[PDB]
Amino acid sequence: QEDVLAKELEDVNKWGLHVFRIAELSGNRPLTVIMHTIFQERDLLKTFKIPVDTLITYLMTLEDHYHADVAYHNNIHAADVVQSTHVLLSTPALEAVFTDLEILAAIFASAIHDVDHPGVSNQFLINTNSELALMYNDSSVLENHHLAVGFKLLQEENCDIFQNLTKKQRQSLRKMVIDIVLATDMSKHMNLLADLKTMVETKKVTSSGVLLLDNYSDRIQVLQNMVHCADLSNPTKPLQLYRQWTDRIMEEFFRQGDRERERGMEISPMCDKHNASVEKSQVGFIDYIVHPLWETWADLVHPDAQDILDTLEDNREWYQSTIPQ
Amino acid sequence: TEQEDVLAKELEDVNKWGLHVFRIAELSGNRPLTVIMHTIFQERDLLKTFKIPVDTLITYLMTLEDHYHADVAYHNNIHAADVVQSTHVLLSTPALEAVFTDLEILAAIFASAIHDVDHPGVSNQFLINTNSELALMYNDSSVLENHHLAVGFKLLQEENCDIFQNLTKKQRQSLRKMVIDIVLATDMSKHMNLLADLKTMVETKKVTSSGVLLLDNYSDRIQVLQNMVHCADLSNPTKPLQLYRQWTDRIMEEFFRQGDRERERGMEISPMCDKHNASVEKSQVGFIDYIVHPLWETWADLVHPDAQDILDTLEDNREWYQSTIP
Ligand SMILES: CCOc1cc([C@@H](CS(C)(=O)=O)N2C(=O)c3cccc(NC(C)=O)c3C2=O)ccc1OC
Ligand SMILES: CCOc1cc([C@@H](CS(C)(=O)=O)N2C(=O)c3cccc(NC(C)=O)c3C2=O)ccc1OC
Ligand SMILES: [Mg+2]
Ligand SMILES: [Mg+2]
Ligand SMILES: [Mg+2]
Ligand SMILES: [Zn+2]
Ligand SMILES: [Zn+2]
């Protein structure tokens, strides 16, 4: 009787789910149990006639293709982005904006968006003349690979969770998922944020402040920025969670810097364990990337993101206080 | 090697629009891409400039040429050789004299050589609609063109194939980026935006005191090279009619073989791919009117009047195909 796990999963609609605890309690299956919970919570198995055993088989297969020896880009991160997207989809300002297929696409994209990540950056893969960068012509190398793996796994035995979608539903979902995962490439962050800003400046809402998004171009942009916000949500979580994410990304960066040092490569910024300032890097990350993004998101869904933005600002203040004068 | 004498004579035409490329394919033992690339590299002194060992060049070209499908009617080594030679002529246009660097010239020619390698003879849309491994690998986005680049670059790593072994690291990095930008621009889903941008450049074009195009940033330079190789890829209707008609015969065979695969699957046969219900001549007139002439009249504007004879041939060939309809 793993009662504690079911207790933890009752917070699946809350920012700040104890995802490391869930990873522990589920036998390192946070992506499987959290995806399954969210699918039940959104009635997605009945809406898209997904057989429960096919869902569980695909989810375990997918989760198996996240590397257990990568400190950050692993199945716990995938589960975290899934659950974060699931909460952002319920923003009151986005009520009635997205179809069931759009909701399914955003959640599936979040689950697969880093699958088979090797724990090094696109630039490292390009600079080492990797087989991945040769395959993908140096362009969104990892993100194209995550998509290819995520979709390829649906072809394994009893893994096609979309088997009862119509032909046209499958084509539409595939296009949306590709557009969403490719937008998680940080080389696209600035263009994405500029478009989110444009939308905020021209946003149409109801009298009760709910966004009105009529064309696909605008809806997919909001979905791209939503999953991007979820991918960049660690500094907006309660500090005890955030500090664990910082420990993990820094371990991954340092392992990349050790591969670089050994090859005699230039050690990438923040990747040198002998010359790193973890706390200054987090404050810079918040000041130049995370807070501009989440402040713009909060304007789009004004005022529903205020608690999230409050947490980010508290955490920035705390990390800054750990830097001595 | 009377045959070798005849081949050498034919290769004296490598600077001319209308080279007898099908004859060269036969005379060279089905090595048109190898012999035309080698001729062009010698003509432009590229082996000396980039310290390319001649045996490495031939080894790579032969391997690249082998990775074109000898059993595909249109997208084979003869098409690659033709696009290479057509780009080589376009690079020599008076309006571009001394404009491009040796590395940019190398990039345009190499891109043309690899730009369709390992083409299976079916379209991107067919590969997407049939859930192919290629479309799965490339997320339905420029599926073939990404594959052609990955193959063309990967083959440089085979034994004695690295023709760029003596470039600097900065040269190799620059060449790789330019080649990717050029081959990705041969995806027809990019044609309309590529043409729109070329028109904008023509409308705003600056010429130097010597009368050549002024291109003073990467964006403009790569855009011209992208459209140049796209024009070469879309050059069949601008060639002498006896060449053009052979290219039409070949693309229609390839289309019909695709539509037969779509028939043997219950799919809606793609337009122009139904050998039981095609109009070859109407399709060429449509191709020229909606794609090839809008492109080439704009290229002709950019380099005016350098390409006037090419444009005149295109317009004559359009009239000829039109005359076969009534
Ligand atoms: C101080 C950075 O902190 C974090 C960074 C990240 C991730 C998000 S991503 C979607 O994987 O790119 N991230 C960046 O945003 C980023 C920008 C530039 C370079 C860079 N990588 C290297 C190897 O240089 C990264 C990087 O890996 C996640 C969590 C973090 O802190 C908890
Ligand atoms: C009447 C068309 O004639 C020709 C077409 C082509 C080629 C050039 S490409 C760079 O390979 O795309 N081409 C198109 O431009 C085109 C547009 C849309 C669909 C299409 N394919 C299918 C299966 O529908 C094609 C197509 O294969 C080359 C030579 C041709 O005539 C000599
Ligand atoms: Mg990622
Ligand atoms: Mg072959
Ligand atoms: Mg092509
Ligand atoms: Zn991620
Ligand atoms: Zn071609």
XYZ file of C-alpha atoms and ligand atoms in Angstrom:
720
model
C 0.000 0.000 0.000
C 1.907 3.021 -1.416
C -0.540 5.464 0.117
C 1.970 8.285 0.464
C 2.435 8.396 -3.320
C -1.298 8.800 -3.923
C -1.325 11.530 -1.254
C 1.482 13.422 -3.020
C -0.325 13.077 -6.351
C -3.385 14.947 -4.987
C -1.300 18.116 -5.483
C -0.986 17.469 -9.237
C -2.998 20.650 -9.925
C -0.694 22.775 -7.719
C 2.492 24.691 -8.516
C 5.138 23.112 -6.329
C 4.214 19.425 -6.478
C 6.791 17.380 -4.518
C 8.149 15.850 -7.706
C 11.382 14.470 -6.227
C 9.337 12.737 -3.528
C 7.071 11.306 -6.222
C 10.135 10.131 -8.139
C 11.328 8.375 -4.966
C 7.966 6.868 -4.015
C 7.170 5.614 -7.543
C 10.406 3.649 -7.969
C 11.875 6.315 -10.306
C 8.740 6.427 -12.427
C 7.634 10.054 -11.943
C 6.950 10.596 -15.659
C 4.708 7.526 -15.905
C 2.695 8.172 -12.727
C 2.349 11.926 -13.268
C 1.329 11.579 -16.941
C -1.157 8.869 -15.968
C -2.625 11.047 -13.195
C -2.962 14.061 -15.508
C -4.546 11.990 -18.246
C -7.161 10.722 -15.782
C -7.678 14.207 -14.312
C -8.338 15.700 -17.786
C -10.470 12.709 -18.928
C -8.090 12.334 -21.837
C -8.247 8.539 -21.997
C -12.017 8.610 -22.564
C -11.920 11.663 -24.850
C -9.313 10.110 -27.197
C -10.167 6.428 -26.535
C -6.662 5.631 -25.276
C -6.464 2.130 -23.755
C -4.985 2.360 -20.261
C -2.498 -0.467 -20.840
C -1.266 1.160 -24.059
C -0.804 4.436 -22.194
C 1.173 2.775 -19.418
C 3.281 0.761 -21.866
C 4.193 3.836 -23.925
C 4.909 5.939 -20.814
C 7.289 3.366 -19.308
C 9.032 2.958 -22.680
C 9.391 6.754 -23.047
C 10.600 7.128 -19.448
C 13.169 4.371 -20.085
C 14.717 6.512 -22.869
C 15.509 9.337 -20.440
C 19.035 8.741 -19.151
C 19.279 7.830 -15.479
C 22.906 9.032 -15.294
C 22.152 12.585 -16.517
C 21.729 14.861 -13.487
C 19.177 17.338 -14.847
C 17.789 16.324 -18.259
C 16.214 13.108 -17.047
C 12.734 11.680 -16.371
C 12.224 13.876 -13.266
C 12.692 17.014 -15.370
C 10.282 15.581 -18.000
C 7.668 14.898 -15.312
C 8.165 18.383 -13.874
C 7.624 20.083 -17.256
C 4.539 17.932 -17.919
C 2.997 18.853 -14.598
C 3.934 22.513 -14.927
C 2.324 22.673 -18.387
C -0.741 20.953 -16.958
C -1.084 23.775 -14.399
C -0.512 26.588 -16.908
C -3.193 25.087 -19.179
C -5.651 25.728 -16.348
C -4.832 29.456 -16.063
C -8.250 31.181 -15.742
C -7.278 33.732 -18.424
C -6.843 30.821 -20.872
C -10.248 29.283 -20.199
C -11.888 28.109 -23.467
C -8.855 29.070 -25.558
C -7.530 25.591 -26.374
C -9.224 22.526 -27.813
C -8.887 19.053 -26.347
C -6.447 18.166 -29.141
C -4.372 21.278 -28.352
C -4.331 20.300 -24.642
C -3.241 16.765 -25.563
C -0.514 18.101 -27.874
C 0.925 20.421 -25.226
C 1.024 17.673 -22.594
C 2.468 15.025 -24.914
C 5.058 17.512 -26.196
C 6.101 18.267 -22.613
C 6.526 14.540 -21.864
C 8.808 13.867 -24.840
C 10.523 17.237 -25.079
C 13.968 16.131 -23.751
C 13.855 12.360 -24.316
C 17.263 10.655 -24.875
C 19.095 13.826 -23.835
C 22.848 13.088 -23.466
C 23.445 15.817 -20.906
C 25.464 18.111 -23.187
C 24.365 21.165 -25.156
C 23.659 21.629 -28.856
C 26.839 23.687 -29.137
C 28.909 20.875 -27.585
C 27.368 18.426 -30.065
C 28.206 20.745 -32.968
C 31.765 21.401 -31.755
C 32.587 17.716 -31.274
C 31.337 16.831 -34.792
C 28.816 14.454 -33.223
C 26.634 12.092 -35.203
C 23.583 14.045 -33.945
C 24.812 17.367 -35.329
C 25.760 15.674 -38.599
C 22.246 14.209 -38.866
C 20.480 17.508 -38.111
C 22.748 19.977 -39.894
C 23.571 21.883 -36.674
C 19.973 23.160 -36.371
C 17.960 22.433 -33.163
C 19.986 19.265 -32.997
C 18.733 17.912 -29.660
C 15.145 19.127 -30.105
C 14.786 17.366 -33.475
C 16.183 14.204 -31.892
C 13.775 14.333 -28.909
C 10.847 14.561 -31.326
C 12.121 11.717 -33.502
C 12.556 9.414 -30.500
C 9.267 10.390 -28.875
C 7.321 9.617 -32.028
C 9.344 6.524 -32.981
C 8.513 4.898 -29.628
C 4.808 4.983 -30.494
C 5.611 2.223 -33.031
C 6.752 -0.225 -30.365
C 4.457 -3.097 -29.413
C 1.249 -1.868 -27.666
C 2.616 1.702 -27.558
C 0.417 3.616 -30.064
C -1.572 5.761 -27.661
C -2.990 7.653 -30.659
C -4.341 4.519 -32.376
C -7.988 5.652 -32.092
C -7.435 9.247 -33.202
C -8.765 10.024 -36.621
C -6.321 10.353 -39.498
C -6.725 14.148 -39.441
C -6.447 14.357 -35.662
C -3.111 12.518 -35.837
C -1.742 14.842 -38.526
C -2.790 17.934 -36.578
C -1.422 16.652 -33.278
C 1.894 15.700 -34.852
C 2.361 19.173 -36.372
C 1.512 20.931 -33.088
C 3.861 18.714 -31.053
C 6.750 19.337 -33.501
C 6.112 23.123 -33.385
C 6.046 23.055 -29.582
C 9.165 20.941 -28.989
C 11.236 22.866 -31.545
C 10.335 26.037 -29.614
C 12.148 24.664 -26.550
C 15.512 25.315 -28.257
C 16.975 28.261 -26.300
C 18.331 29.732 -29.548
C 14.659 30.603 -30.247
C 13.979 32.192 -26.824
C 14.388 35.833 -27.869
C 12.169 35.589 -30.967
C 9.551 33.679 -28.955
C 9.522 36.304 -26.222
C 9.270 39.143 -28.757
C 6.151 37.484 -30.192
C 4.661 36.940 -26.754
C 5.253 40.641 -26.080
C 3.582 41.594 -29.361
C 0.582 39.485 -28.400
C 0.334 41.084 -24.940
C 0.351 44.549 -26.544
C -2.506 43.615 -28.919
C -4.391 41.140 -26.730
C -8.175 40.910 -26.946
C -10.080 39.668 -23.900
C -13.612 39.204 -22.652
C -15.157 41.529 -20.087
C -14.045 38.947 -17.513
C -10.434 39.100 -18.722
C -10.247 35.852 -20.692
C -7.982 35.777 -23.744
C -9.510 35.515 -27.201
C -7.217 33.759 -29.701
C -8.750 33.170 -33.085
C -6.012 31.998 -35.446
C -3.705 29.005 -35.270
C -0.621 31.192 -35.471
C -1.513 32.918 -32.211
C -2.674 29.775 -30.428
C 0.456 27.805 -31.300
C 2.625 30.693 -30.140
C 0.918 30.719 -26.769
C 1.401 26.922 -26.537
C 5.073 27.272 -27.514
C 5.629 29.963 -24.893
C 3.623 27.976 -22.336
C 5.793 24.846 -22.604
C 8.890 27.102 -22.773
C 7.758 28.774 -19.497
C 7.309 25.302 -17.990
C 10.775 24.293 -19.192
C 12.109 27.468 -17.532
C 9.976 27.201 -14.392
C 12.526 25.974 -11.860
C 13.271 29.473 -10.370
C 9.503 30.036 -9.930
C 9.007 26.958 -7.701
C 9.264 26.868 -3.916
C 12.891 27.311 -2.974
C 13.460 23.778 -1.687
C 12.603 22.436 -5.169
C 14.478 25.210 -7.008
C 17.722 24.608 -5.109
C 17.597 20.916 -6.090
C 17.174 21.860 -9.763
C 20.135 24.235 -9.461
C 22.305 21.498 -7.942
C 21.393 19.183 -10.830
C 21.888 21.614 -13.729
C 25.230 22.620 -12.244
C 26.305 18.991 -11.982
C 25.358 18.452 -15.603
C 27.191 21.623 -16.688
C 30.302 20.580 -14.762
C 30.280 17.100 -16.307
C 30.109 18.794 -19.711
C 32.998 21.087 -18.727
C 35.038 18.046 -17.679
C 34.503 16.493 -21.114
C 35.536 19.803 -22.656
C 38.640 20.180 -20.479
C 39.778 16.653 -21.295
C 39.381 17.197 -25.041
C 41.299 20.475 -24.688
C 38.218 22.445 -25.667
C 37.341 25.893 -24.440
C 35.281 25.294 -21.276
C 31.817 26.741 -21.849
C 30.476 29.460 -19.526
C 29.232 28.110 -16.157
C 30.745 24.663 -16.958
C 34.093 25.048 -15.114
C 33.804 23.556 -11.633
C 37.094 25.271 -10.674
C 35.818 28.729 -11.760
C 32.044 28.884 -11.265
C 29.687 31.096 -9.259
C 26.471 29.107 -8.932
C 24.539 31.865 -7.190
C 25.614 34.725 -9.471
C 24.718 32.558 -12.457
C 21.204 31.933 -11.079
C 20.614 35.644 -10.462
C 21.765 36.407 -13.986
C 19.579 33.593 -15.346
C 16.565 35.096 -13.613
C 17.379 38.706 -14.481
C 18.039 38.197 -18.222
C 15.910 35.128 -19.209
C 13.449 33.825 -16.632
C 11.972 36.984 -15.223
C 11.556 38.772 -18.629
C 9.782 35.662 -19.847
C 7.520 35.130 -16.828
C 6.766 38.861 -16.471
C 5.556 38.848 -20.077
C 3.561 35.645 -19.495
C 2.060 37.205 -16.368
C 0.972 40.233 -18.396
C -0.712 37.901 -20.925
C -2.735 36.108 -18.252
C -2.958 39.157 -15.859
C -3.384 38.641 -12.896
C -3.426 34.814 -12.741
C 0.371 34.333 -12.714
C 0.968 36.684 -9.785
C 1.682 33.938 -7.228
C 4.222 32.323 -9.568
C 5.896 35.658 -10.270
C 5.930 36.372 -6.489
C 7.780 33.114 -5.863
C 10.334 33.912 -8.624
C 11.000 37.333 -7.127
C 11.378 35.910 -3.607
C 13.812 33.304 -4.921
C 15.860 35.900 -6.802
C 16.101 37.953 -3.629
C 17.253 34.881 -1.693
C 19.920 33.808 -4.203
C 21.201 37.396 -4.290
C 21.458 37.390 -0.490
C 23.788 34.378 -0.659
C 26.280 36.500 -2.614
C 28.572 38.377 -0.181
C 29.524 42.049 -0.603
C 40.179 5.959 -75.704
C 38.851 7.483 -78.816
C 35.979 7.622 -76.325
C 38.233 9.511 -73.899
C 39.072 11.965 -76.719
C 35.380 12.578 -77.430
C 34.695 13.028 -73.703
C 37.486 15.588 -73.423
C 36.097 17.473 -76.404
C 32.609 17.577 -74.859
C 34.026 18.825 -71.548
C 35.490 21.851 -73.397
C 31.882 23.172 -73.266
C 31.744 23.300 -69.448
C 31.443 27.098 -69.437
C 28.446 27.047 -71.825
C 24.697 26.930 -71.148
C 23.517 23.823 -72.970
C 26.431 21.444 -72.304
C 25.727 17.964 -73.686
C 25.391 16.522 -70.217
C 23.615 13.275 -71.246
C 26.357 12.563 -73.756
C 28.970 13.235 -71.061
C 27.151 10.798 -68.787
C 27.476 8.047 -71.414
C 31.026 8.928 -72.561
C 32.321 9.025 -68.982
C 30.948 5.604 -68.080
C 28.058 7.052 -65.994
C 30.407 9.393 -64.138
C 29.091 12.813 -65.271
C 29.183 14.263 -61.760
C 32.800 13.147 -61.186
C 34.142 14.369 -64.508
C 32.192 17.634 -64.571
C 33.143 18.487 -60.973
C 36.800 17.632 -61.661
C 36.769 19.789 -64.824
C 35.224 22.708 -62.966
C 37.618 22.460 -60.026
C 40.547 22.522 -62.473
C 39.014 25.397 -64.449
C 38.595 27.520 -61.276
C 42.007 26.421 -59.823
C 40.199 25.169 -56.707
C 42.577 22.251 -56.088
C 45.533 24.635 -55.797
C 43.627 27.328 -53.833
C 42.379 24.895 -51.209
C 45.276 22.414 -51.395
C 42.892 19.584 -52.369
C 44.786 16.375 -53.273
C 43.565 15.227 -56.686
C 43.181 11.603 -55.540
C 41.066 12.707 -52.546
C 38.852 14.798 -54.816
C 38.272 11.904 -57.240
C 37.702 9.405 -54.408
C 35.103 11.668 -52.797
C 33.381 12.516 -56.060
C 33.107 8.869 -57.028
C 31.647 7.979 -53.633
C 29.219 10.929 -53.729
C 28.179 9.966 -57.260
C 27.623 6.336 -56.159
C 25.187 7.612 -53.512
C 22.873 8.960 -56.177
C 20.389 6.286 -57.222
C 21.177 4.972 -60.703
C 17.605 3.630 -60.962
C 15.764 6.924 -60.358
C 14.760 8.559 -63.604
C 15.326 12.256 -62.777
C 16.946 12.759 -59.334
C 20.184 10.912 -60.221
C 23.838 11.801 -60.835
C 23.063 13.371 -64.235
C 20.755 15.896 -62.550
C 23.434 16.602 -59.927
C 26.066 17.126 -62.627
C 23.683 19.420 -64.519
C 22.976 21.584 -61.468
C 26.733 21.770 -60.708
C 27.522 22.909 -64.234
C 24.610 25.361 -64.350
C 25.695 26.923 -61.046
C 29.239 27.152 -62.427
C 27.949 29.153 -65.423
C 25.788 31.388 -63.218
C 28.767 32.130 -60.935
C 30.631 33.508 -63.970
C 27.969 36.084 -64.873
C 29.565 39.522 -65.499
C 27.328 41.187 -62.888
C 29.017 39.038 -60.191
C 32.679 39.455 -61.225
C 34.975 39.471 -58.147
C 31.888 39.549 -55.919
C 32.241 36.185 -54.210
C 35.272 34.745 -52.404
C 36.924 31.479 -53.395
C 35.287 29.891 -50.328
C 31.805 31.088 -51.318
C 32.391 29.780 -54.856
C 33.538 26.440 -53.378
C 30.424 26.364 -51.182
C 28.011 27.010 -54.073
C 29.573 24.316 -56.272
C 29.868 21.716 -53.473
C 26.290 22.443 -52.402
C 25.131 21.858 -55.998
C 27.015 18.561 -56.162
C 25.453 17.131 -52.957
C 22.091 18.830 -53.133
C 20.006 15.750 -54.078
C 22.295 12.884 -53.018
C 20.471 9.618 -52.058
C 17.159 10.988 -53.387
C 14.677 8.066 -53.473
C 12.642 9.476 -56.391
C 9.535 10.426 -54.357
C 8.542 13.796 -52.907
C 8.724 15.128 -49.329
C 4.928 14.975 -49.153
C 4.924 11.309 -50.194
C 7.512 10.547 -47.521
C 5.413 12.394 -44.912
C 2.122 10.812 -45.953
C 3.580 7.291 -45.877
C 5.149 7.645 -42.367
C 8.636 6.992 -43.800
C 11.731 6.659 -41.620
C 13.127 9.816 -43.259
C 10.062 11.879 -42.347
C 10.175 10.465 -38.799
C 13.871 11.370 -38.495
C 13.333 14.935 -39.760
C 9.959 15.852 -38.212
C 8.327 16.422 -41.649
C 10.536 19.529 -42.184
C 12.690 19.745 -45.364
C 12.926 15.958 -45.068
C 14.899 15.209 -48.227
C 17.026 18.330 -48.163
C 18.191 17.654 -44.625
C 19.020 14.104 -45.669
C 20.983 15.219 -48.755
C 23.134 17.463 -46.537
C 23.711 14.793 -43.906
C 24.780 12.250 -46.552
C 26.969 14.702 -48.488
C 28.829 15.782 -45.332
C 29.069 12.256 -43.872
C 30.779 10.915 -46.997
C 33.675 13.355 -46.429
C 34.585 11.096 -43.493
C 35.079 7.975 -45.600
C 38.585 6.755 -46.480
C 40.563 9.410 -48.393
C 37.425 11.494 -48.967
C 38.014 14.684 -46.941
C 38.457 17.174 -49.744
C 38.425 19.978 -47.169
C 41.301 18.513 -45.102
C 43.518 21.549 -45.746
C 40.993 24.335 -45.025
C 41.407 26.248 -41.772
C 38.883 25.515 -38.998
C 37.223 28.903 -39.628
C 37.031 28.133 -43.377
C 35.463 24.730 -42.692
C 32.964 26.230 -40.249
C 31.979 28.967 -42.715
C 31.727 26.566 -45.650
C 29.562 24.108 -43.696
C 27.088 26.849 -42.706
C 26.893 28.227 -46.261
C 26.357 24.770 -47.757
C 23.543 24.020 -45.286
C 21.892 27.372 -46.042
C 22.130 26.751 -49.777
C 20.825 23.170 -49.884
C 17.976 23.907 -47.486
C 16.898 26.669 -49.940
C 16.266 24.006 -52.617
C 13.168 22.800 -50.696
C 10.267 23.939 -52.900
C 8.233 24.790 -49.803
C 10.660 27.747 -49.470
C 10.345 28.914 -53.105
C 7.716 31.600 -52.645
C 9.467 33.311 -49.735
C 12.845 32.959 -51.439
C 11.458 34.597 -54.586
C 9.739 37.336 -52.604
C 13.090 38.196 -50.993
C 14.945 38.100 -54.317
C 12.392 40.534 -55.776
C 12.958 42.845 -52.800
C 16.700 42.741 -53.430
C 16.203 43.523 -57.147
C 14.015 46.522 -56.274
C 16.678 47.857 -53.881
C 19.788 46.698 -55.641
C 23.081 48.559 -55.296
C 25.850 48.325 -57.904
C 29.499 49.232 -57.434
C 31.509 51.713 -59.513
C 32.630 48.763 -61.644
C 28.972 47.885 -62.220
C 28.801 44.628 -60.247
C 26.348 43.856 -57.478
C 27.259 45.214 -54.068
C 26.687 42.529 -51.377
C 28.148 43.670 -48.077
C 26.719 41.365 -45.430
C 26.190 37.628 -45.024
C 22.413 37.867 -45.431
C 22.547 39.365 -48.937
C 25.514 37.213 -50.045
C 23.917 33.940 -48.977
C 20.538 34.972 -50.421
C 22.093 35.440 -53.868
C 23.875 32.064 -53.642
C 20.663 30.391 -52.435
C 18.684 31.749 -55.358
C 21.520 30.971 -57.775
C 21.545 27.259 -56.918
C 17.695 27.221 -56.829
C 17.701 28.726 -60.351
C 20.200 26.044 -61.446
C 17.953 23.363 -59.906
C 15.001 24.893 -61.806
C 16.934 25.457 -65.040
C 15.671 22.608 -67.253
C 13.075 24.733 -69.148
C 15.762 27.339 -69.872
C 17.996 24.868 -71.709
C 18.023 24.043 -75.431
C 14.827 22.156 -76.246
C 16.443 18.787 -76.927
C 17.819 18.851 -73.352
C 14.640 20.230 -71.815
C 12.483 17.518 -73.400
C 14.729 14.790 -71.960
C 14.430 16.331 -68.479
C 10.606 16.423 -68.909
C 10.557 12.761 -69.948
C 12.575 11.873 -66.856
C 10.628 13.900 -64.261
C 7.357 12.485 -65.636
C 8.690 8.929 -65.354
C 9.617 9.631 -61.744
C 6.179 11.179 -61.051
C 4.387 8.242 -62.665
C 6.369 5.735 -60.574
C 5.395 7.705 -57.435
C 1.711 7.795 -58.426
C 1.901 4.022 -59.010
C 3.119 3.603 -55.406
C 0.202 5.836 -54.307
C -2.172 3.732 -56.403
C -0.885 0.480 -54.879
C -1.847 1.984 -51.463
C -5.316 3.478 -51.792
C -3.955 7.001 -51.652
C -5.243 9.899 -53.689
C -2.785 9.999 -56.577
C -0.792 13.206 -56.437
C -1.342 15.762 -59.229
C 0.745 14.988 -62.349
C 1.531 11.515 -60.985
C -1.328 9.552 -62.695
C 0.060 7.979 -65.880
C -3.580 7.274 -66.865
C -4.640 10.908 -66.526
C -1.769 13.347 -66.975
C -1.236 16.245 -69.369
C 2.534 16.509 -69.714
C 2.424 19.630 -71.910
C -0.098 21.569 -69.816
C 1.953 20.721 -66.746
C 5.146 22.136 -68.261
C 3.363 25.324 -69.304
C 1.988 25.679 -65.748
C 5.421 24.973 -64.212
C 7.010 27.684 -66.362
C 4.193 30.206 -65.867
C 3.838 29.878 -62.085
C 7.338 28.873 -60.905
C 10.193 28.870 -63.415
C 9.590 32.092 -65.339
C 8.709 34.191 -62.216
C 12.020 33.024 -60.752
C 14.207 33.412 -63.822
C 12.789 36.780 -64.877
C 13.708 38.027 -61.389
C 17.202 36.527 -61.574
C 17.524 38.105 -65.015
C 16.550 41.463 -63.448
C 19.223 41.087 -60.739
C 22.003 40.473 -63.297
C 20.454 42.448 -66.193
C 21.210 42.033 -69.051
C 23.530 39.063 -68.493
C 20.828 36.380 -68.537
C 18.751 37.712 -71.413
C 19.612 34.798 -73.741
C 18.659 32.261 -71.049
C 15.360 34.037 -70.464
C 14.693 34.174 -74.224
C 15.226 30.411 -74.455
C 12.838 29.815 -71.550
C 10.183 31.938 -73.274
C 10.711 30.146 -76.588
C 10.364 26.757 -74.854
C 7.159 27.875 -73.132
C 5.745 28.882 -76.525
C 6.787 25.522 -77.957
C 5.129 23.439 -75.237
C 2.027 25.682 -75.394
C 1.821 25.128 -79.163
C 1.531 21.370 -78.589
C -1.710 21.742 -76.608
C -4.367 22.991 -79.156
C 22.286 29.373 -14.825
C 21.442 28.527 -15.753
O 20.512 27.796 -14.936
C 19.690 26.897 -15.558
C 19.698 26.635 -16.928
C 18.803 25.715 -17.473
C 18.821 25.402 -18.965
C 17.455 25.443 -19.673
S 17.643 24.611 -21.250
C 16.033 24.585 -21.941
O 18.105 23.270 -21.016
O 18.512 25.387 -22.096
N 19.846 26.170 -19.696
C 19.696 27.494 -20.142
O 18.731 28.215 -19.958
C 20.963 27.828 -20.844
C 21.360 29.021 -21.414
C 22.640 29.047 -21.962
C 23.465 27.933 -21.942
C 23.054 26.732 -21.378
N 23.859 25.568 -21.334
C 25.207 25.463 -21.322
C 25.716 24.053 -21.326
O 25.960 26.434 -21.254
C 21.778 26.700 -20.806
C 21.049 25.594 -20.137
O 21.378 24.402 -20.025
C 17.944 25.030 -16.633
C 17.923 25.272 -15.263
C 18.801 26.192 -14.717
O 18.851 26.522 -13.393
C 18.038 25.762 -12.485
C 5.725 19.894 -64.204
C 6.855 19.852 -63.212
O 8.048 19.672 -63.988
C 9.221 19.575 -63.307
C 9.323 19.558 -61.921
C 10.571 19.483 -61.304
C 10.683 19.428 -59.788
C 11.716 20.397 -59.185
S 12.010 19.858 -57.509
C 13.315 20.869 -56.922
O 12.517 18.528 -57.519
O 10.841 20.099 -56.707
N 9.396 19.578 -59.100
C 8.755 20.794 -58.824
O 9.147 21.894 -59.161
C 7.503 20.436 -58.097
C 6.486 21.256 -57.645
C 5.415 20.626 -57.018
C 5.378 19.249 -56.856
C 6.411 18.431 -57.302
N 6.404 17.018 -57.168
C 5.320 16.203 -57.090
C 5.632 14.755 -56.862
O 4.170 16.606 -57.218
C 7.492 19.055 -57.934
C 8.725 18.489 -58.538
O 9.143 17.355 -58.530
C 11.718 19.366 -62.097
C 11.617 19.378 -63.491
C 10.378 19.466 -64.102
O 10.163 19.516 -65.454
C 11.300 19.257 -66.305
Mg 15.513 20.621 -24.169
Mg 23.914 4.812 -56.397
Mg 16.063 18.461 -54.192
Zn 13.712 20.667 -20.817
Zn 17.579 19.024 -57.600
